[PDB]
Amino acid sequence: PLTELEESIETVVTTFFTFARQEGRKDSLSVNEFKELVTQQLPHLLKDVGSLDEKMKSLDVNQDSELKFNEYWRLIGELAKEIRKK
Amino acid sequence: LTELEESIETVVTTFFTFARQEGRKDSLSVNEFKELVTQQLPHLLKDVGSLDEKMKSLDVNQDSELKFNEYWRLIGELAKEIRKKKDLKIR
Numbered sequence: 453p454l455t456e457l458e459e460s461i462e463t464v465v466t467t468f469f470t471f472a473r474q475e476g477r478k479d480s481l482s483v484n485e486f487k488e489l490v491t492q493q494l495p496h497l498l499k500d501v502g503s504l505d506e507k508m509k510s511l512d513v514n515q516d517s518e519l520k521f522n523e524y525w526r527l528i529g530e531l532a533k534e535i536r537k538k
Numbered sequence: 539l540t541e542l543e544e545s546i547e548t549v550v551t552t553f554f555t556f557a558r559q560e561g562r563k564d565s566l567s568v569n570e571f572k573e574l575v576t577q578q579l580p581h582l583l584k585d586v587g588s589l590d591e592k593m594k595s596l597d598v599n600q601d602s603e604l605k606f607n608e609y610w611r612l613i614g615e616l617a618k619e620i621r622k623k624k625d626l627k628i629r
């Protein structure tokens with residue numbers, strides 16, 4: 453099977469698709485799916501994020517009202533880079 | 539921590555675990571990078587070829603070290619290949 457690091461990378465990727473398949477396109481997060489992912493799975497790392505509707509807008513870099521995997525990955529990188537600082 | 543948060547913490551911590559071994563404690567020398575790949579990415583980087591060449595390719599500022607940003611670009615490469623398998627095209 454996978455190492456601790458490999459399984460962790462796989463979990464990060466799987467979590468996107470778990471949330472993205474709930475409604476509309478199965479390969480992107482709507483605002484509702486993004487809000488679910490944050491509230492369910494990032495309640496600690498995003499505790500101080502403020503308005504989720506604004507954060508969605510900020511991450512939606514091509515202004516199509518959905519987060520594709522690349523845009524979610526940008527969020528993961530932001531969270532990683534904050535953790536690194538500790 | 540949630541499953542997702544634990545996983546992001548693991549990805550970050552694994553870097554420092556290998557980086558603190560010798561030299562600058564916040565970067566991977568080529569020896570520390572080879573240890574990380576062999577011990578912790580043996581499957582995802584099974585087909586990577588020369589580790590010394592991979593190190594060079596990841597060492598974007600040619601300082602002979604991988605700082606966290608440079609390791610994170612590797613994790614992104616690996617994540618994109620996983621993404622392909624978690625969203626298969628029937629075509």
Ligand SMILES: [Ca+2]
Nearest residue numbers: 472475477480
């Ligand atoms: Ca969706």
Ligand SMILES: [Ca+2]
Nearest residue numbers: 512516518519
């Ligand atoms: Ca978008």
Ligand SMILES: [Ca+2]
Nearest residue numbers: 557560562565
């Ligand atoms: Ca080092």
Ligand SMILES: [Ca+2]
Nearest residue numbers: 597599601603
């Ligand atoms: Ca470097």
